[PDB]
Amino acid sequence: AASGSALIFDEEMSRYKLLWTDPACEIEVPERLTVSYEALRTHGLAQRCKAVPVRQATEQEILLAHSEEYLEAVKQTPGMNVEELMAFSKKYNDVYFHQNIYHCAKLAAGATLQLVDSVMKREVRNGMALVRPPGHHSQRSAANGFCVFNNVAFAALYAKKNYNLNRILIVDWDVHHGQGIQYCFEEDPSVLYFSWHRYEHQSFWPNLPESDYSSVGKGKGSGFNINLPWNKVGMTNSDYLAAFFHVLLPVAYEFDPELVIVSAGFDSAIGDPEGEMCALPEIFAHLTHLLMPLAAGKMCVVLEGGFNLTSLGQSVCQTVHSLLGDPTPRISGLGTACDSALESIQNVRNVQSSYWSSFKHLAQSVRTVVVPPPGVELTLPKNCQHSISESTAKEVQRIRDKHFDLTDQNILRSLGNIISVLDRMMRSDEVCNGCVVVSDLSVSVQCALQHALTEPAERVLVVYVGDGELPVKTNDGKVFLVQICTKETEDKCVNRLTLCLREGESLTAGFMQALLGLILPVAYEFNPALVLGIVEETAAKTRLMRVWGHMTCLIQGLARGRMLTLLQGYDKDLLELTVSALSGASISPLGPLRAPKPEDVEMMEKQRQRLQERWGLLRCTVSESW
Ligand SMILES: NCCCNCCCCCC(O)(O)C(F)(F)F
Ligand SMILES: [K+]
Ligand SMILES: [K+]
Ligand SMILES: [Zn+2]
């Protein structure tokens, strides 16, 4: 039962710097480290995190990913003067050395191990390490690209040996390719390495053909190395989210990592002189959030790059915000990925399709308000509450007279409860989300949505779980309706998405692929002000409630996390699961998910072809030119 978020940091790692004029290395300054921590303090985030002390990495730990020949060469640098430090730096590609850099490199390595021990010993839920020098360019016998030792490589090897881990996911969202990490795990199918990076047809540093999408791994580890090259600059939020939805996330949940490590470099953020991208710092609150259902939340974030001092702290804060569980900012303006990004996304999916079958194509502190039935007390997490007002009961009496004949007082209580929690979610912002146990489905749902439009909730997303007619139409304001059922139907409207999954053992896999590839792209582009989750009696405790905790966790990326959930009937297990995932707890893994049955893959692709014209964030192929 892990608790909070670790923040490993030490100011000693800022006590090395460039000592000669060297235009390639001028951007790597100690101020990157002090600005990232000071920004965490100004916004009160550091004080909220469990500080963990920085230790040195033992030379046996360093030899996990490096050779004695190179370690002993670095170990001799603290005795060098400046002229000897230049002579040693010139032996390597874009990296300087300092009398103190060997010391700090051992701290950056040990700090990463400290973070691994913290998360793996269930001492913390997750954590971030603010280390310097970076890691992912460092190779077995050479320093490269400001890196001395591969901090992320150690963590994965350290977590393998000392915790007997079989499946580790490494996500490298730094704008540069982490060839050091690729080389280290090239033939290793236990460490899935994903990296997007500014490539520009190999014209951008490090200018390696192995950085291209062709490198899917060697030997038994082929298919466990995924490169996504950005071939043009100016990539935006829609590009990064299309990369997650249609490349990284489908592979990650099938892989089911036992631990997620992140090469977090924020030179992929707007304003950075090296990445020249256009993604806002808020995007990293979502990249983080979309990964947290993996590995029961066990997530280690290690600082890599990020060179614009202003935009850097903003991106660090968004990551720690999400790491602590704060509501994710609403991302607006999302649409289709540019044609270059779609080109790379389409190529990676095809080259990886021989290893991941879902990529194949056909030939051409109050957070949650819990409102259960009367006289049933329950055990609720620390940040959970309970229930009515007269202005509410008056308004419910107004609603009851004008639109309903409604007599039962038990469902008059729920209508007053639904309104009360909705007003606290929007107008007053006290709570984020809530759950209400409901008897009458059609009235509760139709009253909830109609009251939400007056809050005002501009656009509402409605996720319905069950068969039969929906209690809400496509007309009630700006709404997008999503139904998960088993009754085969073919919808016509562009704001409706009906997913008829084929019941059985593979209901778990088809759901997740439909969530990451269809539901989440549309919802993120829709940008709802409120999410309305519904589940009827017929679908409760049944086979598709395995993914429900995952959906209600991932869907909180929309609408600042404001999600009202209406449970029909009463299931103790179900209400337990929704409230936990609404409250921010960790989600139990689903195990290694096989590929869904091709009968569901086809229905999903028919839905994608139907909506990707209107909702361009569904596209994972270049647009056919007209
Ligand atoms: N001909 C001159 C090429 C200079 N290119 C410098 C690229 C440095 C990349 C470092 C980084 O941002 O990946 C890290 F995270 F490691 F800091
Ligand atoms: K990268
Ligand atoms: K690998
Ligand atoms: Zn970088």
Residue numbers in the entry: 1 to 364, 412 to 434, 437 to 453, 455 to 676
What did the original publication write about this model?
Here we report enzymological studies conclusively demonstrating that HDAC10 is a robust PDAC and a poor lysine deacetylase. Therefore, HDAC6 is clearly an acetyllysine deacetylase and HDAC10 is an N8-acetylspermidine deacetylase. In addition, we report the 2.85-Å resolution crystal structure of HDAC10 complexed with a polyamine transition state analogue inhibitor. This structure reveals that the conserved glutamate gatekeeper and a sterically constricted active site confer specificity for N8-acetylspermidine hydrolysis and disfavour acetyllysine hydrolysis. Given that HDAC10 is a PDAC with catalytic specificity for the hydrolysis of N8-acetylspermidine to yield spermidine and acetate, it is possible that the functions of HDAC10 and spermidine in autophagy are linked.
To provide a molecular foundation for understanding the PDAC activity of HDAC10, we determined the 2.85 Å-resolution crystal structure of Y307F zHDAC10 complexed with the trifluoromethylketone inhibitor 7-[(3-aminopropyl)amino]-1,1,1-trifluoroheptan-2-one (AAT), which mimics N8-acetylspermidine24. This inhibitor binds as a transition state analogue with Ki=0.7±0.2 μM. We treated full-length zHDAC10 with trypsin to yield a heterodimeric complex, designated zHDAC10Δ, comprising the amino-terminal PDAC domain and the C-terminal pseudo-deacetylase (ΨDAC) domain. The proteolytically nicked zHDAC10Δ construct retains substantial catalytic activity. Both proteolysis and the introduction of the deactivating Y307F mutation facilitated crystallization. The crystal structure of the Y307F zHDAC10Δ–AAT complex revealed an overall butterfly-like architecture with a pseudo-two-fold symmetry axis perpendicular to several α-helices defining the PDAC-ΨDAC domain interface. Interdomain interactions were mediated by α-helices αF and αG, loop LH (which connects αH1 and αH2) and the C-terminal tail of each domain, burying ∼1,700 Å2 surface area. A close-up view of the active site tunnel revealed a canonical HDAC active site at the base of the tunnel, with AAT binding in an extended conformation. The trifluoroketone moiety of AAT formed a gem-diolate, making asymmetric coordination interactions with Zn2+ (O1-Zn2+ and O2-Zn2+ coordination distances of 2.1 and 2.5 Å, respectively); hydroxyl group O2 also hydrogen bonded with H136 and H137. On one side of the active site, gatekeeper E274 was close (3.7 Å) to the N4 atom of AAT. Opposite E274, there was an additional constriction contributing to PDAC specificity: a unique one-turn 310-helix ηA2 (P23ACE) resulting from a two-residue insertion plus a two-residue mutation in the L1 loop relative to zHDAC6, effectively lengthening the narrow active site tunnel by ∼5 Å.
